[PDB]
């Protein structure tokens, strides 16, 4: 089976009233459903006795209540280990102090397991359902560490990693000195954090920072420590600041990974892509960095190795739009469609950004017959479009001279939450009323303009006084005339005076032609009466046209004389 | 027992006793009559005695661009919510009690002279 | 008073008559009028009346439909399941030949019911 293009994603309720009608509702509907799940779990865990009868065979461990409280109330080591597994930072510290004051021996492995908990969360309680630098100066972790009787390599490593995690870069480098003075050897994970601290500790020029990092790496070779993927990924992530200076050094890191045997992940190329994609002219370098990155990744199935693997596709598409290369974008999308690579697209914000840049590049550089196939395959099945992609789509229909689709784009626009977007309705009306068309098309444009007019009238801004742009009124009026709905056009002329919007010259001239057809002198005067209010120069010349073209009754002649008096 | 409970419609149909040998021949008269009341009228889904604030059900889902978390009204503010619901209940009762009277006819108990309004509009958009 | 919410048109109106239907109903699912592009009606009609339409039709919801098991889907499903099957020995052409080589028969029964256990 393949994706159903007429449907919204499977997570939503397949019902016309409950289906998301916009990108905003797509995000909020799932958050409301997750909120309901959280409320149920909160209740299940708060009142577990109601949910303890197990009638399932085989047993389902994942449908039983969770117990987050320690069940050992004795003061001993084996009771502390329970509070550490439950990740109770305060209870574990209190139990550790009392246990220490009593004078009982607490093992080293357990003391380290207590630091790993404090150093990770920073002496703070992890989030629960319901009851700058963050390395607090007064922190239990450093105290327990000092009071510690015997300290092994692992003890320092968990302190150095926690400091860097919480942005205590300067403290972590100072602690890395003691580790060396004590003839100890750190691990790769400690070195990964120290590389992050070396760059973020102080602001310096690239050459100074690039000399320290190479010193950490050489130290890592002296201590017989082998670098992992995150070691090289941290270097590339930290060189993002220097941009142009780090472009060639960053490519030296990538070539080193290949030789050593570490395999670049999606994150390794995301960091290189972001480093080279600096504001400027990308053609000089960014062109051949992305073309070589995709030839390497062509037809490769990816597995999660780095936390930043879910950012490559969003980054790679961002350059394809900048370069305006549609062949490259298809290769990027082709990689996303091989095997299970589609799961690396990222969160909803990254999914909508990727498809916005992808589709906006299709509408621009692709044939309109293929563009409308992607429009059907992606929207709403893959993502809900932003109002700027609806506009980018109309600009593509115009360039293709296929304007019979405009009424469909307005119908779809409403179904995607763009009924009351001003930039969109103006764009639709301007294209429809830009030029005259065969009678069949002109009638279709007038049924759409009518539906747009209704949107302007019934806006949610109706709480405020209704605001009609000048272009919208001119276009909607012209479309009614060209369709033969003259009655509707004449009624609208009042709205030019009510909202004080200047009538367009083209609209006034087409009104005169509709009068000469109906041979109605009063309406023709109503036109000259309108242009006279705004003091348009065409009016004085138009009054001459009205005289000759239409029979002027004595009352009408005096009325023109009154306007002539104004002249 | 939870399984012995019935719906409001079942409970009112029994309690009101509008169908029966009493109501068949008006064998029973009603100076004091049980009156049906809709008890779901002013009730908001998600509102309970404990005063919990469920994001997306009884409070907004997002606040300041971030998803709200489970919270519970404090005793003082929950107490004011309950009081406000009681006043809204007696207020709703008071408004219903107020009704506009109609002018009598030739006499207080006579139908003669009372206006019935215009005849109903005919099927073919006819009006009187 | 803010505007009330409008239900979208049924997505059957966007379906092409040459679509891949198994993608619409890939697995067993309840009948959905907005997703099934068929003017199917169910219900004993009232006198001089028609069977009720599919929208809000509980009788069509009560049916264990086979929309996920169309002949097109079954044939595609089994083409993917052929890789999981093994070949019966050709030498065992008849029951008498099986008895000769395999004289013991073991009978066991599996029971599929609906429920938690």
């Amino acid at each position: 089976v393949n994706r159903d293009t007429t449907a919204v994603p499977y997570v939503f309720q397949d019902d016309p009233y409950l289906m998301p009608a916009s990108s905003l509702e797509s995000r909020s509907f799932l958050l409301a459903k997750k909120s309901g799940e959280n409320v149920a779990k909160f209740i299940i865990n708060s009142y577990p006795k109601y949910f303890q009868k197990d009638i399932a065979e085989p047993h389902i461990p994942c449908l039983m209540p969770e117990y987050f409280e320690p069940q050992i109330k004795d003061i001993s080591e084996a009771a502390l280990k329970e509070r550490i597994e439950l990740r109770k930072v305060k209870a574990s510290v209190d139990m550790f102090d009392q246990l220490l004051q009593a004078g009982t021996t607490v093992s080293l492995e357990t003391t380290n397991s207590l630091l790993d908990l404090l150093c990770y969360y920073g002496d703070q309680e992890p989030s629960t359902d319901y009851h700058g630098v963050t390395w607090r100066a007064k922190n239990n972790a450093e105290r327990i560490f000092s009071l510690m009787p015997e300290k092994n390599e692992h003890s320092y490593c968990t302190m150095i990693r926690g400091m860097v995690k919480h942005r205590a870069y300067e403290q972590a480098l100072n602690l890395y000195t003691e580790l060396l003075n004590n003839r100890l050897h750190a691990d790769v994970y400690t070195f990964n954090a120290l590389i992050e601290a070396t760059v973020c500790a102080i602001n310096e020029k690239f050459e100074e920072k690039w000399s320290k990092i190479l010193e950490l790496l050489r130290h890592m070779v002296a201590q017989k420590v082998k670098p992992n993927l995150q070691t090289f990924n941290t270097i590339l992530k930290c060189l993002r600041r220097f941009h142009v200076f780090a472009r060639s050094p960053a490519l030296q890191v990538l070539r080193e990974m290949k030789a050593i045997g570490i395999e670049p992940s999606l994150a390794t190329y995301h960091h290189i892509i972001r480093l080279f994609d600096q504001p400027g002219d990308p053609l000089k370098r960014s062109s051949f960095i992305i073309y070589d990155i995709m030839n390497e990744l062509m037809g490769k199935r990816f597995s999660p190795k780095d936390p930043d693997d879910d950012k490559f596709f969003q980054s790679a598409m961002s350059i394809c739009s900048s370069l305006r290369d549609l062949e490259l974008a298809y290769q990027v999308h082709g990689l996303l469609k091989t095997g299970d690579n589609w799961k690396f697209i990222g969160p909803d914000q990254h999914r909508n950004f990727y498809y916005s840049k992808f589709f906006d590049l299709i509408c621009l550089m692709e044939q309109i017959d293929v563009t409308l196939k992607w429009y059907e395959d992606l929207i709403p099945s893959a993502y809900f479009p932003h109002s700027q992609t609806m506009i980018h789509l109309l600009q593509a229909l115009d360039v293709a001279n296929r304007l019979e689709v405009i009424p469909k784009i307005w119908k779809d626009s409403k179904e995607y939450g763009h009924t009351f977007r001003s930039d969109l309705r103006e764009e639709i009306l301007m294209l429809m009323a830009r030029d005259k068309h065969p009678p069949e098309l002109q009638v279709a444009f007038a049924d759409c303009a009518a539906d747009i007019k209704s949107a302007y009238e019934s806006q949610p801004i109706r709480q405020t006084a209704q605001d009609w742009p000048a272009t919208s009124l001119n276009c909607i009026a012209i479309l009614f005339l060209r369709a033969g709905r003259t009655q509707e056009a004449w009624k609208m002329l009042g709205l030019f005076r009510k909202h004080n919007k200047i009538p367009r010259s083209e609209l006034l001239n087409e009104l005169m032609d509709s009068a000469k057809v109906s041979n109605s002198p009063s309406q023709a005067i109503e036109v000259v009466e309108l242009a006279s209010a705004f003091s348009l120069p065409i009016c004085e010349g138009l009054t001459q046209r009205v005289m000759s073209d239409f029979a002027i009754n004595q009352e009408q002649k005096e009325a023109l004389s009154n306007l002539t008096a104004l002249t | 027992s939870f399984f012995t409970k019935l719906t409001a419609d079942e409970l009112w149909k029994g309690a009101l006793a509008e169908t029966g040998a009493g109501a068949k021949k008006g064998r029973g008269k009603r100076t004091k009559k049980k009156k049906r009341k809709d008890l779901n009228r002013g009730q908001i889904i998600g509102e309970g005695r404990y005063g919990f604030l469920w994001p997306g059900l009884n409070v907004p889902l997002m606040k300041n661009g971030a998803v709200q978390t489970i919270a519970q009204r404090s005793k003082e503010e929950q107490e004011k919510v309950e009081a406000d619901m009681i006043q809204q209940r007696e207020e709703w009762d008071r408004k219903k009690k107020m009704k506009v009277k109609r002018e009598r006819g030739w006499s207080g108990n006579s139908w003669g002279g009372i206006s019935l309004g215009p005849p109903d509009p005919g099927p073919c958009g006819e009006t009187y | 008073r803010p505007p009330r919410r409008k239900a979208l048109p049924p997505r059957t109106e966007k379906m092409a008559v040459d679509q891949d239907w198994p993608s619409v109903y890939p697995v067993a699912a309840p009948f959905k009028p907005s997703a099934v592009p068929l003017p199917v009606r169910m219900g004993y009609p009232v006198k001089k009346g028609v069977p009720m339409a599919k929208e809000g039709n509980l009788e069509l919801l009560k049916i264990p439909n086979f929309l996920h098991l169309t002949p097109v889907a079954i044939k595609k499903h089994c083409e993917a399941l052929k890789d999981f099957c093994t070949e019966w020995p050709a030498a065992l052409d008849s029951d008498e030949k099986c008895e000769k080589h395999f004289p013991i028969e073991i009978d066991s029964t599996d029971y599929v019911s609906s429920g938690p256990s």
Binding site: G417 | - | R5, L8
Partner: peptide, 16 residues
């Protein structure tokens, strides 16, 4: 009857 006997719109896709 004389006592009184008183017992006293637009739709949008993706509304807000």
């Amino acid at each position: 009857y004389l006592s009184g006997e008183e017992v006293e719109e637009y739709e949008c896709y993706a509304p807000d």
